[PDB]
Design a protein around this ligand. Structure first.
Ligand code: F6C
Ligand code: CLA
Ligand code: CLA
Ligand code: CLA
Ligand code: CLA
Ligand code: CLA
Ligand code: CLA
Ligand code: CLA
Ligand code: CLA
Ligand SMILES: CC1=C(/C=C/C(C)=C/C=C/C(C)=C/C=C/C=C(C)/C=C/C=C(C)/C=C/C2=C(C)CCCC2(C)C)C(C)(C)CCC1
Ligand code: SF4
Ligand SMILES: [Ca+2]
Lengths: 61, 139, 80, 739, 46, 42, 31
């Protein structure tokens, strides 16, 4: 590879020197991004229930 | 390698653990005049064979207890030896260290950790502040 | 490891060596007592600190002293 | 080995869970750290003290901020006698609607806690009126804590690390801490009372915006420099003065009236200003006693080493050899810490004994729960400080005392008759215990058998005489201040008893706690307190004096302050170290302070009820304490929640049981000992190794807690349960029956 | 056994009796002991 | 109303988020930090 | 009349100064 990802490059800030590492990183990135987006979406979609939760309003009944 | 036949034992829960395979293990070997029943150091009874035996034990105190209080005191067996076995395979014989039992004085043994005074003359800790020397280690 | 020291009041009765459950002590030639022998502690790495040796010592005060120190696997008496 | 702990390779090489436990226990024992020098010891301590000071300032900032943010300080100003001060808001998401309603009170629209620390009364007396003033104080303390945090870092940089000689210079430190830290601070506080607090108590606002051009007295500073100091005492606050208003308000800034302000039932603000003025002068004078750099001044080393009394040959002060002591204190940080802890312990006891009897804050004497909380808080802290004074005294004997440099001096003499000291302390404890308990159970049997007239009821005549000598005419004695014709009351040469009319009014007032009437029930409990004081002293003194050694362990000094035992030999040596004596003494300190706070609380409960006769007739036998104090006053506490609902006492109910639970857990650590648990842990170690799907494995081998660690952990649960159980009962039994 | 008592104390203190382990909340009926009582009563004909 | 946790004080939404953060959100990451600190090899 | 939203936010920002200095002192004492 050209530049910082060549064999002789000593770039300590760019340590993923293998293609397989990059593909595994990409798979993790996609799955984690989808999971985090869905987690935020679920928290926001249930914001009324979660706001009652964090104020103790679910303990009326 | 350590030679000898393991005593007849059906298995127990007080045997070796991960420490035997990871850090160290101990082996006690002895010769008996006959087949007889002895007590395993960690519970249960085992049958020592007619010839020479070999028992694997988790701690050195097990060998001293078995050899000292059972083999010597009860079965009149005085030729037991304790080895320390490391995971790499290195084996060293540790008891009796020089072939003579420690309670019997043997020539050539040096004095180790001997203090040339009575215990009441140890210096006060205030004299040895910030020096790192304990009162019992003071000259 | 624990530290085991032997002082000059030892009378060479061999009782501390016999009482040791891990063979830390042995008896060595000496001339300071009638028995012509004194206790030694060459194997303090195997000392557990039970202080059985101090219990067996007949002199007053003790001719053998155990000072509990850094704890290791074998000093803690751990089979695991 | 592990990096943690950085200060001990012996612990860092420990392969068991004991390594983590002991790292936290010995982290602040700087002297035992690897490669620790004396100079590095003092420098690390000096920076540590900066951190502790910053923590105190942050703590005070948090108290101010939460009151200004969520409290009701401004509402409480308008009616201090009927408005409940608010500590902070409650945000517990597990609350139900009944709990939310129960804790929504004191005029708030959200759940809140009721402040019982007295900070509302304190800030009100010192002239704070608005939440913005509290907020500015909170912000100021944040910056002050930042200043001390930076100072600690600065004095660790290589150029600013003080030398060991700087730390050892005792005379300049005493001069600056007496004249400056005690004197100038007292003078500055008196300035705050004169310039701010007193004008604010008269309806006049004085702040940073107008204090430069608003004189505190009409005579100005001219009266001070011309010698006309009496102008400051003219026209004091009238007996009809209304606090925080100009109605009936005088102009004097330094009076010496004595007694209490008739409305607030607290000490006069102008009296407190003159108090800190006179205290400042005395301490500034005291700060010039020792020589630093100009020849004049005493040398403490010379005074201790002196052997001539105006020519006559003497052993020393009071004909007692004090030589060699200067180096003993100056080289022993534990000796210095022992005096500092003892002085703070006595000061904390004096705070508790004097704040309830002479309330210094407006209307704080009428906040019954606050009064009980403050007295119990400062007495228990005093007991802990007293234990620490003797604990570090025992540490001094082992670590810092050497017989050679103290040969023949007064410190060596004490060690040479320790048996006489310990045996006589044992006799006093036995005499007090046998007769105090014996008289209780004698009264128990008589009252139980319907013969309450057959009780032994010794009158506390000696203490009653002291109260009469202070002006209490209730007992009918006619001595000293209770006798108007006595030379003490008249002060015949000068008649300068301008304090006496105010003092006598407060003394003979039946609505305050100034010299509460005492009878036979008070006689017995003080002898219970004397028993507790002497036994706790006996345990602590015996541990300190036997720290070097005893017949059972002649060489105890070579083993350190805290070791488990010396084995089962020689009969057995459990709890033989000096640390163990401090461990045992905490049990007696808790018991003694229990008797002290039980007595204070029950006596004040009877007075506040209007049922003083209950205490007078029931405190003479132990069943009266158990029935009319414990059982009787627990009723409303244990009904904070029940099958019918919850009220505001539900927290004190839950914490009451929480303290009992922590107390019970301590018994496990204290009764069961290590070898039982080590064998059990070994069995669990086997189970884990043989169970599939349990991929976890210990990096540190699980071991039972050490012998010493068990005593400490058990003592901690015992103490925490002790404080939590009584604190919940103290708050609930007083706040449930009053404001 | 015991930590559910602590659960009950906290629920009752919170003013949440419906979350308690009780006959009126989360019920824990000893059905096997109740069954034995019914069997032993019906054995004699009662 | 007294059926929910509320606050009449300024920024009453602060306890709404700070109580979860300090008590059951951050403490486990904090324990993880300390655990890594006390287990690091020399 | 208790403090306002701005005052609470100002106190939070101001508290960062002792917060960072506490970290500096703690790490310095660790040396
Ligand atoms: C790590 C890993 C591990 C593992 C895996 O891997 C395990 C496993 C086992 C098995 C085998 C068994 C069964 C289980 C049960 O049931 O029980 C438990 C429970 C639980 C729950 C446990 C727990 C589990 C795990 C831990 C999980 C974790 C997760 C989390 C969430 C984390 C979190 C984190 C954050 C940061 C906080 C057991 C047991 C026992 N343990 Mg055992 N573990 C361990 C850990 C631990 C520690 C630390 C300690 C101390 C505390 C102990 C303790 C104990 C005791 C006492 C006992 C008993 O008894 C038991 C037995 O033996 O039988 C028989 N052990 N274990
Ligand atoms: C499942 C049980 C449970 C749990 C987990 C909580 C959790 C909580 N409650 Mg709570 N509560 C409960 C049951 C429970 N409650 C019940 C049954 C009641 C009665 C109905 C209450 C009544 C109640 C009130 C009235 C209040 C709380 C508060 C709180 C919060 C503060 C944390 C705490 O209590 O101390 C946890 C303690 C610590 C984390 C310790 C901090 C670390 C310091 C440095 C220790 C220092 C020790 C100290 C110096 C030595 C002692 C000093 C002492 C003598 C003064 C927290 C959200 C308070 C709140 O709203 O907080 C914002 C509050 O005001 N609760
Ligand atoms: C007038 C000058 C002055 C002042 C005001 C102080 C003030 C202080 N010094 Mg100090 N010091 C001074 C000169 C001064 N020093 C000099 C000249 C030296 C060198 C000889 C030292 C050497 C020195 C050391 C070595 C240490 C202090 C420490 C302290 C603090 C003690 C903790 C505290 O707040 O006590 C409480 C303050 C009160 C007013 C309460 C007193 C109330 C009592 C109980 C009633 C009686 C305190 C802030 C300690 C520290 O590091 O703190 C950061 C410490 O270890 N000082
Ligand atoms: C039973 C004895 C007792 C009592 C009644 C008090 C009373 C008081 N203390 Mg206190 N205190 C005591 C002993 C006591 N103290 C001891 C022995 C210590 C040393 C650790 C302290 C340390 C201490 C600090 C550091 C502070 C107080 C404060 C206060 C005041 C407000 C708290 C309150 O309402 O009461 C306390 C009510 C209780 C029921 C006490 C028990 C509280 C918990 C449950 C005890 C267990 C602690 C924890 C849960 C275990 C570790 C985690 C009040 C005047 C505060 C103050 O000054 O107000 C501004 C404050 O910041 N105290
Ligand atoms: C200003 C006061 C002061 C100072 C500077 C010291 C300083 C010291 N003491 Mg000391 N002490 C004091 C007051 C003080 N003490 C008091 C009042 C008592 C009586 C209770 C004691 C009783 C005492 C004993 C019995 C021992 C010491 C020891 C020590 C030294 C080592 C500290 C240690 O073990 O690591 C730090 C230790 C800890 C952090 C202990 C953990 C906390 C304990 C268990 C309390 C439980 C926490 C509780 C639940 C909540 C508290 C609030 C939380 C934030 C911690 C150190 C020089 C030890 C020593 O010198 O060994 C030879 C020792 O054995 N002290
Ligand atoms: C209710 C609990 C209780 C009681 C009554 C005692 C009693 C005593 N403790 Mg003690 N202690 C306790 C709990 C208790 N402790 C706990 C929990 C601890 C923590 C471990 C300690 C730690 C401790 C230490 C460290 C020390 C004491 C000391 C003392 C003695 C000093 C008081 C004294 O002489 O009074 C007089 C004696 C008594 C009141 C005891 C009762 C006497 C009985 C009632 C006489 C009855 C005679 C009768 C014929 C008996 C019937 C026959 C029967 C044998 C079958 C005394 C024997 C000190 C000591 O021994 O100094 C002399 C001491 O150094 N104790
Ligand atoms: C029903 C009445 C009653 C009872 C049952 C007791 C019971 C007891 N008293 Mg007691 N006492 C009482 C009334 C009573 N007292 C009265 C009215 C007084 C006068 C105020 C005293 C004054 C008193 C003192 C001064 C002492 C006791 C002691 C004792 C205990 C041992 C007494 C004994 O003979 O041991 C058997 C006797 C011996 C083993 C040796 C003799 C001990 C005596 C008391 C001292 C020698 C007498 C001599 C004149 C020196 C006096 C010293 C004194 C001036 C300080 C015992 C628990 C002693 C105690 O608690 O010890 C710890 C103790 O020293 N009592
Ligand atoms: C730890 C708890 C504790 C302690 C130690 C005390 C201790 C004391 N309380 Mg007390 N008290 C407590 C808790 C406690 N209390 C509680 C919880 C309450 C409930 C609120 C009370 C309520 C209370 C009241 C209401 C009174 C006391 C009083 C007293 C004192 C009695 C004085 C006396 O009779 O001596 C008698 C001594 C003499 C008559 C002296 C005789 C001559 C001697 C021998 C001197 C001889 C000349 C001398 C050598 C020369 C001087 C030399 C000098 C310069 C060195 C005493 C100091 C009384 C007191 O005086 O308070 C100030 C008092 O009226 N207490
Ligand atoms: C030491 C002082 C102190 C103490 C004990 C408390 C206590 C409390 N605060 Mg608080 N607070 C303080 C100062 C303090 N405050 C200051 C100075 C500010 C302004 C920045 C705030 C701002 C604040 C907000 C905005 C909120 C609280 C809340 C709370 C409660 C829940 C805990 C929480 O969420 O923390 C939150 C803490 C912060 C946002 C910052 C705290 C900053 C202080 C100075 C840190 C102190 C660190 C301490 C000294 C080091 C301990 C050392 C260790 C050995 C013990 C609790 C009653 C919550 C509440 O009211 O619930 C009902 C809440 O939402 N606090
Ligand atoms: C530097 C710093 C800082 C900052 C910080 C930050 C920037 C933070 C952030 C943070 C964040 C931003 C975080 C986040 C997180 C996240 C998470 C935690 C997530 C989770 C998720 C999940 C759990 C998911 C799940 C899932 C999946 C996976 C699939 C299916 C679905 C679900 C949803 C289930 C500050 C200034 C403060 C201070 C100073 C320092
Ligand atoms: S028991 Fe004591 S006297 Fe006997 S040999 Fe050992 S050290 Fe010497
Ligand atoms: Ca619900």
């Amino acid at each position: 590879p050209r530049g910082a990802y060549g064999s002789t490059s000593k770039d300590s800030l760019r340590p993923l020197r293998n293609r397989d590492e990059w593909y595994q990183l990409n798979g993790g990135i996609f799955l984690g991004a989808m999971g985090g987006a869905v987690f935020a979406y679920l928290l926001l979609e249930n914001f009324d229930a979660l706001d009652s939760i964090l104020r103790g309003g679910v303990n009326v009944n | 390698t350590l030679e000898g036949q393991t005593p007849i034992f059906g298995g127990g829960t007080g045997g070796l653990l991960t420490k035997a395979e990871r850090e160290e293990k101990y082996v006690i070997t002895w010769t008996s005049p006959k087949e007889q029943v002895f007590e395993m150091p960690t519970g249960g009874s085992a049958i020592m064979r007619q010839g020479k035996n070999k028992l694997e034990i988790a701690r050195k105190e097990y060998g001293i207890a078995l050899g000292g209080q059972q083999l010597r005191a009860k079965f009149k067996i005085n030729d037991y030896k304790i080895y320390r076995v490391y995971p790499n395979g290195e084996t060293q014989m540790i008891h009796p260290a020089d072939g003579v039992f420690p309670e019997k004085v043997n020539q050539g043994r040096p004095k180790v950790r001997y203090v040339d005074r009575n215990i009441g003359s140890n210096p006060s800790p205030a004299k040895l502040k910030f020096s790192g020397v304990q009162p019992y280690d003071a000259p | 490891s624990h530290t085991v020291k032997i002082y000059d009041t030892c009378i060479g009765c061999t009782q501390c060596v016999r009482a040791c459950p891990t063979d830390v002590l042995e008896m060595v030639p000496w001339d300071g007592c009638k028995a012509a022998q004194i206790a030694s502690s060459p194997r303090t790495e195997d000392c557990v600190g039970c202080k059985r040796c101090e219990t067996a010592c007949p002199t007053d005060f003790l001719s053998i002293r155990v000072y509990l120190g850094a704890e290791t696997t074998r000093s803690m008496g751990l089979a695991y | 080995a592990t990096k943690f702990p950085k200060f001990s390779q012996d612990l860092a090489q420990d392969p068991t869970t004991r390594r983590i436990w002991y790292a936290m226990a010995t982290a602040h024992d700087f002297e035992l750290h690897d490669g620790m020098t004396e100079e590095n010891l003092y420098q690390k301590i000096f920076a540590s003290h900066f951190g502790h000071l910053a923590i105190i300032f942050l703590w005070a900032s948090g108290v101010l901020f939460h009151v200004a943010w969520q409290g009701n300080f401004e509402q409480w100003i308008k009616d201090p006698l009927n408005v409940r001060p608010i500590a902070h808001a409650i945000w517990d998401a597990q609350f139900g609607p009944p709990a939310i309603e129960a804790f929504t009170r004191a005029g708030a629209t959200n759940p809140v806690d009721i402040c019982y620390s007295g900070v509302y009364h304190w800030w009100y007396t010192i002239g704070m009126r608005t939440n913005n003033e509290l907020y500015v104080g909170a912000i100021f303390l944040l910056l002050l804590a930042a200043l001390f945090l930076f100072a600690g870092w600065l004095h660790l940089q290589p150029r600013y690390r003080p030398t060991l000689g700087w730390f050892k210079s005792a005379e300049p430190r005493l001069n600056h801490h007496l004249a400056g830290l005690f004197g100038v601070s007292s003078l500055a506080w008196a300035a705050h009372l004169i310039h701010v607090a007193i004008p604010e108590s008269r309806g006049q606002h004085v702040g940073w915006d107008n204090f430069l051009f608003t004189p505190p007295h009409p005579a100005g500073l001219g009266a001070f420099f011309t010698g006309n100091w009496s102008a400051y005492a003219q026209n004091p606050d009238t007996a009809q003065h209304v606090f925080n208003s100009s109605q009936g308000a005088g102009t004097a800034i330094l009076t010496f009236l004595g007694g209490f302000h008739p409305q607030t039932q607290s000490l006069w603000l102008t009296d407190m200003a003159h108090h800190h003025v006179a205290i400042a002068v005395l301490f500034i004078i005291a700060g010039h006693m020792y020589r630093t750099n100009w020849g004049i001044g005493h040398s403490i080393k010379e005074m201790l080493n002196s052997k001539s009394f105006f020519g006559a040959k003497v052993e020393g002060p009071f004909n007692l050899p004090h030589q060699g002591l200067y180096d003993t204190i100056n080289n022993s940080l534990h000796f210095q810490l022992s005096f500092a802890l003892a002085a703070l312990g006595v000061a904390s006891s004096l705070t508790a004994q004097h704040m309830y009897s002479m309330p210094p804050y407006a209307f704080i004497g009428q906040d019954f729960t606050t009064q009980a909380a403050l007295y119990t808080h400062h007495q228990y802290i005093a007991g802990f400080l007293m234990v620490g004074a003797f604990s570090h005294a025992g540490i001094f004997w082992i670590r810092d005392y050497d017989p050679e440099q103290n040969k023949g001096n007064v410190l060596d003499r004490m060690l040479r008759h320790k048996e006489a000291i310990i045996s006589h302390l044992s006799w006093v404890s036995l005499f007090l215990g046998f007769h105090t308990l014996g008289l209780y159970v004698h009264n128990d049997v008589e009252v139980a058998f319907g013969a309450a007239e057959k009780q032994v009821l010794i009158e506390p005549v000696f203490a009653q005489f002291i109260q009469a000598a202070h002006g209490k005419a209730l007992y009918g004695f006619n001595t000293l201040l209770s006798n108007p014709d006595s030379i003490a009351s008249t002060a015949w040469p000068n008649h300068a008893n301008v304090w006496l009319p105010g003092w006598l009014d407060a003394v003979n007032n039946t609505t305050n706690s100034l010299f509460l009437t005492i009878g036979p029930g008070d006689f017995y409990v003080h002898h219970a307190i004397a028993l507790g004081l002497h036994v706790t002293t006996l345990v602590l003194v015996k541990g300190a004096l036997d720290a070097r050694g005893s017949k059972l362990m002649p060489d105890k000094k070579d083993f350190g302050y805290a070791f488990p035992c010396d084995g089962p030999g020689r009969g057995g040596t459990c709890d033989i170290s000096a640390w163990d004596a401090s461990y045992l003494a905490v049990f007696w300190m808790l018991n003694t302070l229990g008797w002290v706070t039980f007595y204070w609380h029950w006596k004040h409960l009877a007075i506040w009820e209007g049922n003083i006769a209950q205490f007078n007739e029931s405190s003479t036998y132990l069943m009266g304490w158990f029935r009319d104090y414990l059982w009787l006053h627990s009723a409303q506490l244990i009904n904070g929640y029940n099958p019918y609902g919850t009220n505001s006492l539900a927290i004190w109910s839950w914490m009451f049981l929480w303290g009992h639970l922590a107390w019970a857990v301590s018994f496990m650590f204290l009764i069961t000992w290590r070898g039982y648990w080590q064998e059990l842990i070994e069995t669990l170690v086997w189970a884990h190794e043989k169970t599939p799907l349990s991929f976890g494995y210990w990096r540190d081998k699980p071991v039972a807690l050490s012998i010493v660690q068990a005593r400490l952990v058990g003592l901690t649960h015992f103490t925490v349960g002790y404080i939590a159980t009584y604190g919940a009962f103290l708050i609930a039994s007083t706040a449930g029956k009053f404001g | 056994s015991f930590a559910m008592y602590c659960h009950n104390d906290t629920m009752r203190a919170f003013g949440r009796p419906q979350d308690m382990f009780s006959d009126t909340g989360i019920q824990l009926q000893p059905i096997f002991a109740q069954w034995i009582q019914h069997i032993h009563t019906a054995a004699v004909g009662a | 109303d007294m059926t929910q946790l509320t606050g009449s004080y300024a920024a009453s939404w602060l306890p709404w988020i700070m109580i979860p953060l300090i008590f059951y959100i951050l403490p486990f990451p904090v324990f993880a930090l300390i655990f890594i600190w006390i287990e690091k090899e020399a | 009349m208790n403090i306002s939203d701005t005052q609470v936010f100002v106190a939070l920002v101001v508290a960062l100064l002792p917060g960072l200095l506490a970290f500096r002192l703690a790490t310095e004492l660790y040396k």
